[PDB]
């Protein structure tokens, strides 16, 4: 599913991302924009055989299991396919685990380079939240 900006903002708010770990809602919307362009089915293959999945491009060697890299971690305890669902629950729950381990949103380089320090509130402007 390709979410609309405000549609995604509303879904993320319903799932408790607004101000989660000190990050206002716009941070999450901006991160999703630059990671997946709001497409839940976004995937990207890496040189080590791992794959990044979903709206927040979560990596399979650490956060989820896709069985393609035996011995890898599955810190979010979920099949990577769950991160491609039109229902963003799995992506949100995993993002919460990632952002709360001590590195904040810097875990998403795209967020650090394209969102950090900007007027992130602009991403939820004009939205019915």
């Amino acid at each position, epitope marked *: 599913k390709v979410f609309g900006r405000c549609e995604l903002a509303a879904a993320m708010k319903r799932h408790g991302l607004d101000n989660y770990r000190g990050y206002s809602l716009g941070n999450w919307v901006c991160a999703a924009k630059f990671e997946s362009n709001f497409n839940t089915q976004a995937t990207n293959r890496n040189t080590d055989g791992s794959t990044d999945y979903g709206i927040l491009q979560i990596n399979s060697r650490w956060w989820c299991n896709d069985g393609r890299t035996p011995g890898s971690r599955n*810190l979010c305890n979920i099949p990577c396919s769950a991160l491609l669902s039109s229902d963003i629950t799995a992506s949100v729950n995993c993002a919460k685990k990632i952002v709360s*381990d001590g590195n904040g949103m810097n875990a998403w380089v795209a967020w650090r380079n394209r969102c950090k320090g900007t007027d992130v509130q602009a991403w939820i402007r004009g939205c019915r939240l």
Partner: nanobody, 131 residues
Framework: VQLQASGGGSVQAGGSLRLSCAAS????????MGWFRQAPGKEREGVAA????????YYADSVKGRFTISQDNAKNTVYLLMNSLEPEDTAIYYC??????????????????????????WGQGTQVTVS
């Protein structure tokens, strides 16, 4: 974390040396383990890096073909085999690590040419001298 390394020393040009490094204080990471070096009076520079997850390796052009970085991710250790050493390789070598568990795939080689950006942990430095 706390990085401790061993090995190195003095050797004649054309010789070989093998550096070892162990990280202590991690529970999940590190995400990256690498080697940097600093010649007398110069700024520190990257040498090689490796992704703890996956084992992808990265090297500075100055050492490609002569140096090989390897690891034991289960024990949070990293190694640097240095063959065909030359006088210009003389410097203080540093073991380094990036503790951030990135969400999306992150190439550990990025910090090699960006002044060690991302590498938050550093060893004390081990001398390597090539005559």
């Amino acid at each position: 974390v706390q990085l401790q390394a061993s090995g190195g020393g003095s050797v004649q040009a054309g010789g070989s040396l093998r550096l070892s490094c162990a990280a202590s204080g991690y529970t999940i990471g590190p995400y990256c383990m690498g080697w940097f070096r600093q010649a007398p009076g110069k700024e520190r520079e990257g040498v090689a890096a490796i992704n703890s997850g996956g084992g992808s390796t990265y090297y500075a052009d100055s050492v490609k073909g002569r140096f090989t970085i390897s690891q034991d991710n289960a024990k949070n250790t990293v190694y640097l085999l240095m063959n065909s050493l030359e006088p210009e390789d003389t410097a203080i070598y540093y073991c380094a690590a990036d503790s951030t568990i990135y969400a999306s795939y992150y190439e550990c080689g990025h910090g090699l040419s960006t002044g060690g950006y991302g590498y938050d942990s550093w060893g004390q430095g081990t001398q390597v001298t090539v005559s």
